[PDB]
Write a protein that binds this ligand. Structure first.
Ligand SMILES: Nc1ncnc2c1ncn2[C@@H]1O[C@H](COP(=O)(O)OP(=O)(O)O)[C@@H](O)[C@H]1O
Ligand SMILES: Nc1ncnc2c1ncn2[C@@H]1O[C@H](COP(=O)(O)OP(=O)(O)O)[C@@H](O)[C@H]1O
Ligand SMILES: Nc1ncnc2c1ncn2[C@@H]1O[C@H](COP(=O)(O)OP(=O)(O)O)[C@@H](O)[C@H]1O
Ligand SMILES: [Mg+2]
Lengths: 537, 526, 535
């Protein structure tokens, strides 16, 4: 008679109501961590680890989910870090409210393919309207655009101070790693900034190290820990005793030739260490291993040798100091040449005190003048929060300098799109106009969440918010009310042009493209079959 | 991990707080509204609920379905009590009260998640309800030519729509004619105990009938009932409350005798006590005897020899209907029997309807009661037919004392959305998002008339909002044709107090769900 | 999600909702058809004269072989609420008419099978149910076309015997197909009131005793009770019985209340002996003064009263049941007397050969009443080879007693053997085109389901269903439609008027009416709220 599957089958409006409650179970979590009045959470594990964070990606990655519609919204937050980097609480609330308003349409016996086709006409028109209603590029504002866009990202986190201490350190970090490319591409690789953590003084003592901050120790306590006018030798091979390979064995037939082979394992080893040290090299960085026999040659000659450094850290030092990453001997059948003209340069390599640990600093690197940020917090829970908040702040200034276009934040984009799409649904709307009209109400949840978390008036402040944006579209008298946002500290609509509340363009363009595409896949689960777990057979 | 005291809070109780509590109450009312959602409209199906004992009850009434779900949710019990009060006040407002009260919470469900302290929602719900119950009274039509054939036609149209959405398809013209004729035979009290609805298994719905008199089920008799033939052209009924047995003992009598000459005189006196009571029933014309107390083998054979009929162990609910049918009086003592206490009928026979025997009375013109015998093919079929009969009786019971009727279907629920949206555009403040949300919540009654049979319900609401804003105010949803139609001209009528008590009970239930902010449950459940 | 909210709170609506079962879907209507078709496919093989019986085993281990559709569905342990409505459907046909209890379940399963293909085309289930009411109305009006009977209950019993042979032809009484058919005709006409057209089945006592054969079943005009002569030397044959029916035990009169009679002297104790000695001589003389030679008593006898019966030549039975003596006073024309002092010659019953008959080696000795005088109560004595053939014959002959009762209620007949179902299927197909607006597909599904009952007779008779039905249905359109059906041995031609296959009009009128209304209550249901496990 029925289906003889050994799992479970649920059809109809059961799964159509379960996917909305699965998406609302995720959105109601992250609704309390949006905007400058948002608050952080606690993520406690079974082993006892506590993670205090408010970013939309760190919470949903550590949180376990079971529903298939819940894994779509959790993987939607992971894509926002790679594509944009701060846009990762706002996408989850929009994509869940896109399913909440579309559930009210399919309960009115409206076909979901008209809602899918109605959402594509509203998503492509939202990108078209936001690209024709921008204020200015990065020429008029200058450095004031980079600082004000950085403070908007920090307002939802622990580094949202009233001053410009953390804002100036981010702009000075991205501007110091300007790496040009072919065909006129000024790239800004923000992954080259080594963000370090140390439980020390307050947040106002966060050092901006112009150069690189290596997270390693010297090793042997007989080397000079401060070298002025240093020459960095970046190399990746273990400075240990000469061990033969698997194909080579030592089969001796004469007992007199025994001790000459035993001394040869250290003579070939020390032959490399004398030709890399006679060329003026004082700092040697190694990703392999330097044993206790080879540490004597640096104490005797007065050189610094750092062992077991990361491979991702050696590439950031050799590119910034002009050093060449050498793995072995080379240069056309040469015995030991080392190409001594390709040594790195540094002004000062100094191991400072980082509150009961050792940290090596390189000052200005003499070739590229890179930057590294050492964070200072109260405990380890604040340092993990300060690292995530700084990494999201580095991604904001990266997209502004690459794509010179900013949009007003604080719900100013979602207020203008809530009224333009209602007029867009009336012109060319015959049967898909109800999906475009619900696309505007789903976008209004971003200024609605700012009024809930601020404990302000909800149905009056957003009603006063769209009152200025309606007059900016139907009354062409140059009212300039396209930048009207929210003042959550006062509870009144303010102008985000003069207040300095700036967000990048692709933090809302890619947010509206990812949330609309995720809402289509969850809208097509009218039939769902769940099989039994095959564990013990 | 937070609460670890030495002395706990109360015992172990959990309590939600704030905005997650209120959405938990609104979404709970949406689940219990699905059990009355598919039972609306003439194209609405019924539901079958089986309990733990295995008893099946198939019905579509809101007062029958919601009482068998065994709902233990605190907020969802509010929608069950308004379905019970609608059956107690009106009788046919049941599925519409539960579903409309759930829409009052779902239309404010995006509003309660974003601010909007609920004292503004309670004030807006009470304001829109008082304007809704006043526009019904100002538009409900009435007549000034009653006590004629036109008033009986008004009672028949309200009973056909009350018999709609039931298990009756083509028997609307047959059953609803009997419902109007049932309440017109009653007195000026309209008591529901003055009409017997008895279910006889076997026969179609066309085999049912409305007896002008009464009829009982012919309960357990004794030897002598195959005699006493059932042909009476003008009998008299003796309603009694006495025992006609030889063993009538007062349970405290000790008859101490001394000799054998007086011992036989006691046994002869015990037969003379019973035979003197039978001589009082005799010599008075009372050929039919009815008593709620049992009759032994002695008085059964005495009436068979004197060509008299009797019936013992009659239920007390049937003797009260028998007293108002024949116009007599129940006499406990047989010494005061006369012509003023006996009944009078014309046709009294014992038929064989459905296999079981039934002693029916007919022919009495001064009949203040009636009996509607139901014939069906199943026990659950006749229980639904009895439940559908009570909804048509309680509609026509209230229609006599208040003949103000309105249009059926979604005609009133759509035009109340017109008068409330026009009122919401004339007041400032936050009430434009609440009075207008109250008007959009009333549009689900024409939605469930269409969603149960397709009908393209999105396009049919654009025709309803355009017709009510242009011309008449009684345009609703046609069931046979997939179009809008004037329900007042199509004789789809319902009394005005059906929708007045529906809007009043749904608003007071919706104001109670939004007013509770904490729910504390004690774990002691024994 | 279920049992949890989006805010983390537990979401409990009803009690024990985890162990519940709820189906709305599109398979809730599909589960009702597949549960009802398996009941109709079971009862399809037991239809017609070639219908094979079914063996039913009770919970106590008792085995009853039944063929009638009322007792088959009633003795099942089916815990399915859709199939439980098919049990009450066959019970409602037995309580009202009592002949088509098998055919009303195959017809209801045929209407649901044709509605399954109509459900996949997008038709609403109430629209199919509203289309079946407009289609069954044509079958009622077309069934009243050819209907006539000439029964006068004097000498024209030939339409009454041939009507009962159609009911008894499908049972296991075909060996007594002519003998037992005449028993059920004469048993109804002697007890029926023709002035009121009312038949009382309490006057027809159906008794059974193992032994003999099926041909030894006789219609005893009178009563058959278990004779309990307290004296073993009582005469076992009374030629002319003046029956004295009484309801008082042969004892000194005991009151109904507490007495505690006091004895003081020895003159009072000697008065106790003379009181009882004269009481047993008074209760015996008051019967002999009326001229009676037979006594019936409901209660027991005393040992002192037993020998006084033999001295006065007065046979008497002991410990007769409640409704058993009620049948004696009607069969003999006597009156049931409460006391002994109210005995007279007018309250005596008249009977002829009053005797007891021993059956083989048993000690039952039932009463046989041969001669009577205008009795209104008969007793059928069913004999057989085992208790399986007797309890079935009690159920088979009860269906034969009901079809004679339906002829007194309505003297209109039809012709069975599938002849009325093919003729009614042509009436719905002719009115399906007048007009084919909305319910065209619902009426053609009714006519295709009415042809399942005659094609089930062709399947049980070893023929082909679609080959035989196409030949019979085409012959009713080319000419005026006769009583044209089928049979097992086929009796030569297929004319039901010549083969004397006669069924009642109101029997088939309630087969279409009850199966349509039961289909409407199982099509107008879109949810099931059954629980899970028992505990
Ligand atoms: N000063 C401010 N005034 C008003 N709104 C602000 C201000 N600063 C930040 N916001 C709002 O807070 C929101 C924070 O979003 P966020 O959680 O950072 O997104 P993501 O998770 O993608 O990084 C932004 O959408 C922005 O509109
Ligand atoms: N002939 C008809 N045409 C259109 N709609 C109808 C017709 N008959 C009844 N209805 C609708 O069916 C609905 C039945 O409601 P009902 O379940 O009886 O309410 P309650 O449960 O309060 O008695 C009514 O609201 C009415 O509008
Ligand atoms: N001699 C015959 N020729 C053809 N058909 C017959 C003959 N005798 C009986 N039948 C058919 O056998 C069927 C038996 O139905 P039955 O099972 O007795 O119905 P129910 O269960 O209601 O008593 C009848 O419908 C009748 O048409
Ligand atoms: Mg039969």
């Amino acid at each position: 008679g029925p289906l003889s599957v050994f799992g479970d089958r649920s059809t109809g409006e059961t799964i159509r109501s379960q996917n909305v409650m699965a998406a609302a179970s995720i959105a109601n979590i992250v609704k309390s961590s949006l905007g400058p009045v948002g608050l952080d959470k606690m993520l406690v594990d079974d082993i006892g680890d506590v993670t205090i964070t408010n970013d939309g990606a760190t919470i949903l990655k550590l949180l376990e989910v079971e529903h298939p519609a819940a894994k779509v919204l959790c993987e939607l937050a992971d894509l926002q870090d790679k594509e944009v980097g701060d846009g990762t609480t706002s996408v989850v609330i929009i994509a869940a409210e896109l399913l909440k308003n579309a559930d009210e349409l399919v309960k009115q016996k409206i076909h979901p393919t008209s809602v899918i086709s109605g959402y594509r006409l509203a998503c492509k028109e939202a990108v078209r309207y936001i690209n024709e209603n921008l204020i200015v590029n990065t020429d008029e504002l200058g450095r004031d655009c980079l600082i004000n866009a950085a403070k908007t990202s920090m307002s939802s986190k622990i580094i949202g101070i009233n001053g410009d201490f953390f804002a100036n350190m981010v702009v000075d970090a991205v501007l110091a790693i300007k790496y040009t490319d072919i065909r006129g591409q000024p790239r800004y690789p923000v992954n080259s900034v080594n963000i370090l953590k140390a439980h020390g003084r307050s947040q106002m003592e966060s050092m901006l190290i112009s150069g690189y901050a290596l997270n390693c120790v010297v090793g042997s306590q007989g080397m000079p820990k401060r070298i002025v006018n240093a020459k960095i030798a970046c190399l990746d091979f273990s400075l240990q005793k000469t061990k033969m390979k698997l194909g080579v064995q030592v089969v001796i037939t004469d007992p007199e030739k025994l001790d000459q082979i035993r001394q040869r394992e250290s003579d070939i080893t020390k032959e490399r260490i004398q030709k890399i040290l006679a060329t003026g090299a004082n700092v040697i960085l190694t990703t392999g291993g330097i044993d206790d026999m080879c540490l004597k040659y640096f104490v005797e000659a007065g050189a610094m040798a750092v062992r077991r450094v990361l491979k991702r850290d050696l590439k950031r030092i050799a590119k910034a100091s002009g050093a060449t990453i050498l793995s072995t001997l080379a240069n056309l059948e040469g015995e030991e040449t080392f190409e001594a003209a390709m040594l790195g340069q540094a002004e000062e390599v100094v191991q400072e005190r980082i509150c009961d640990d050792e940290l090596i600093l390189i000052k200005n690197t003499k070739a590229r003048t890179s930057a590294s940020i050492i964070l200072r917090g109260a405990n380890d829970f604040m340092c993990d929060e300060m690292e995530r908040s700084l990494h999201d702040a580095l991604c904001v200034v990266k997209r502004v300098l690459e794509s010179k276009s900013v949009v007003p934040g604080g719900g100013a984009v979602e207020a203008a799109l809530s009224i333009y799409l209602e007029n867009y649904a009336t012109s060319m709307g015959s049967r898909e106009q109800l999906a475009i009209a619900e696309f505007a109400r789903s976008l209004l949840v971003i200024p609605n969440t700012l009024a809930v978390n601020a404990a302000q008036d909800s149905t009056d402040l957003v009603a006063k918010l769209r009152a200025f944006h309606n007059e900016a579209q139907v009354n062409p008298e140059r009212k300039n009310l396209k930048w009207i946002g929210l003042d959550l500290s006062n509870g009144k609509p303010r102008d985000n042009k003069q207040a300095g509340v700036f967000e990048p363009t692709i933090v809302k363009v890619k947010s509206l493209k990812f949330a609309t595409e995720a809402a289509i896949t969850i809208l097509r689960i009218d039939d769902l079959i769940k099989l039994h777990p095959e564990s013990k057979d | 991990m937070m609460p670890t005291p030495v002395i706990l809070l109360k015992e172990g109780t959990d309590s939600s707080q704030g905005i997650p509590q209120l959405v938990s109450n609104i979404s709970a009312c949406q689940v219990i509204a699905e059990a009355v959602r598919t039972t609306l409209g003439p194209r609405g199906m019924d539901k079958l609920i089986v309990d733990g004992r295995g008893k099946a009850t198939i019905s579509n009434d809101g007062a029958t379905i919601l009482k068998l779900l065994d709902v233990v949710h605190p907020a969802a019990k509010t929608l069950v009590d308004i379905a019970k009060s609608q059956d107690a006040e009106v009788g046919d407002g049941t599925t519409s009260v539960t579903l409309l009260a759930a829409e009052f919470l779902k239309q404010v469900k995006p509003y309660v998640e974003e601010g909007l302290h609920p004292q503004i929602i309670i004030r807006a719900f009470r304001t829109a309800t008082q304007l809704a119950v006043n526009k019904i009274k100002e538009i409900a039509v009435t007549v000034k030519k009653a006590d004629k054939v036109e008033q009986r036609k008004l009672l028949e149209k309200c009973a056909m729509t009350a018999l709609s959405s039931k298990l009756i398809s083509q028997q609307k013209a047959f059953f609803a004619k009997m419902v109007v004729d049932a309440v017109m035979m009653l007195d000026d009290l309209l008591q529901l105990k003055m009409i017997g609805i008895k279910k006889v298994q076997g026969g179609a719905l066309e085999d049912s009938q409305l007896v002008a008199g009464v009829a009982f089920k012919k309960t357990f008799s004794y030897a002598g009932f195959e005699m006493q033939p059932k042909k009476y052209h003008n009998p008299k009924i003796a309603l009694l409350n006495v025992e006609l047995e030889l063993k009538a003992e007062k349970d405290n009598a000790e008859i101490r005798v001394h000799t054998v000459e007086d011992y036989q005189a006691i046994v002869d006196a015990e037969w003379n006590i019973l035979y003197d009571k039978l001589e009082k029933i005799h010599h008075s014309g009372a050929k039919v005897v009815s008593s709620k107390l049992p009759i032994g083998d002695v008085a059964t054979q005495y009436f068979a020899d004197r060509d008299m009929f009797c019936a013992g162990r009659v239920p007390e609910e049937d003797l009260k209907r028998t007293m108002m049918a024949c116009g007599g009086s129940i006499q406990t003592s047989v010494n005061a029997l006369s012509a003023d206490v006996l009944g009078r009928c014309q046709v009294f026979e014992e038929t064989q309807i459905g296999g079981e025997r039934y002693n029916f009375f007919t022919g009495c013109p001064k009949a203040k009661t009636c009996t509607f015998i139901l014939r069906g093919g199943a026990e659950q079929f006749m229980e639904e037919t009895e439940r559908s009969l009570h909804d048509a009786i309680m509609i026509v019971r209230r229609a006599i004392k208040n003949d103000s009727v309105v249009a059926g279907g979604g005609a009133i629920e759509m035009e109340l959305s017109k008068y409330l949206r026009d009122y919401s555009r004339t007041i400032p403040g936050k009430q434009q998002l609440l009075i207008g949300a109250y008007a959009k919540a009333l549009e689900i009654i024409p939605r469930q008339l269409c969603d149960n049979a397709g009908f393209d319900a999105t396009n049919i609401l654009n025709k309803l909002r355009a017709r009510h804003a242009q011309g008449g105010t009684w345009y609703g949803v046609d069931i046979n044709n997939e179009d809008i139609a004037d329900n007042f001209e199509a004789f789809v009528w319902e009394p005005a107090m059906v929708r007045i008590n529906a809007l009043t009970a749904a608003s007071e239930a919706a104001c109670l769900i939004v007013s509770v902010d904490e729910t504390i449950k004690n774990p002691r459940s024994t | 999600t279920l049992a949890f909210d989006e805010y983390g709170r537990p979401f409990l609506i009803i009690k024990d909702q985890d162990r519940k079962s709820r189906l709305m879907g599109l398979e809730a209507l599909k589960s009702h058809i597949m549960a009802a078709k398996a009941v109709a496919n079971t009862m399809r093989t037991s239809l017609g004269p070639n219908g094979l019986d079914k063996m039913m085993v009770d919970k106590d281990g008792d085995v009853t072989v039944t063929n009638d559709g009322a007792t088959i569905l009633s003795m099942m342990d089916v815990d399915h609420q859709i199939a439980k409505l098919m049990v009450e459907l066959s019970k409602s046909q037995d309580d009202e008419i009592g002949d088509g209890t098998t055919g009303v379940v195959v017809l209801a399963g045929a209407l649901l099978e044709e509605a399954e293909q109509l459900l996949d085309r997008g038709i609403h289930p109430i629209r199919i149910a509203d289309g079946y009411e407009q289609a069954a109305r044509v079958a009622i009006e077309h069934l009243d076309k050819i209907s006539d009977s000439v029964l006068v209950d004097i000498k024209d019993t030939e339409p009454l015997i041939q009507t009962a042979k159609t009911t008894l032809g499908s049972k296991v009484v075909n060996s007594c197909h002519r003998q037992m058919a005449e028993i059920a005709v004469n048993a109804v006409l002697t007890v029926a009131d023709m002035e009121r057209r009312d038949v009382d089945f309490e006057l027809i006592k159906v008794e059974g005793k193992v032994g003999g054969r099926l041909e030894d079943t006789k219609l005893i005009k009178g009563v058959i009770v278990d004779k309990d002569f307290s004296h073993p030397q009582m005469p076992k044959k009374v030629e002319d019985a003046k029956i004295a029916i009484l309801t008082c035990p042969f004892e000194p009169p005991k009151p109904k209340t507490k007495h505690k009679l006091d004895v003081t002297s020895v003159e009072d104790y000697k008065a106790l002996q003379k009181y009882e000695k004269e009481k047993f001589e008074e209760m015996i003389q008051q019967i002999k003064e009326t001229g009676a030679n037979l006594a019936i008593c409901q209660w027991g006898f005393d040992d002192e009263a037993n020998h006084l019966l033999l001295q006065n030549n007065l046979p008497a039975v002991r410990w007769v049941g409640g409704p058993e003596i009620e049948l004696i006073a009607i069969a003999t024309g006597g009156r049931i007397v409460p006391r002994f002092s109210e005995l007279t010659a007018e309250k005596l019953g008249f009977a002829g050969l009053v005797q007891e008959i021993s059956f083989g080696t048993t000690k039952d000795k039932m009463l046989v009443i041969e001669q009577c005088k205008n009795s209104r109560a008969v007793t059928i004595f069913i004999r057989g080879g085992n208790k399986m053939i007797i309890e079935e014959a009690k159920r088979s002959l009860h269906d034969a007693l009901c079809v004679i009762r339906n002829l007194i209620r309505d003297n209109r007949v039809v012709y069975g053997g599938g002849a009325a179902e093919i003729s009614c299927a042509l009436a719905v197909s002719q009115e399906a085109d007048k007009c084919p607006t909305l319910e065209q597909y619902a009426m053609r599904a009714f006519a295709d389901a009415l042809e399942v009952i005659p094609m089930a007779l062709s399947e049980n008779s070893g023929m082909n269903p679609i080959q035989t039905m196409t030949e019979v249905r085409a012959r009713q359109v080319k000419e005026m439609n006769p009583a044209l059906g089928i049979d097992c041995l086929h009796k030569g031609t297929n004319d039901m008027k010549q083969q004397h296959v006669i069924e009642t009009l109101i029997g088939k009128k309630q087969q279409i009416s009850l199966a349509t209304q039961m289909v409407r209550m199982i099509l107008k249901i879109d949810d099931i709220r059954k629980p899970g496990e028992s505990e």
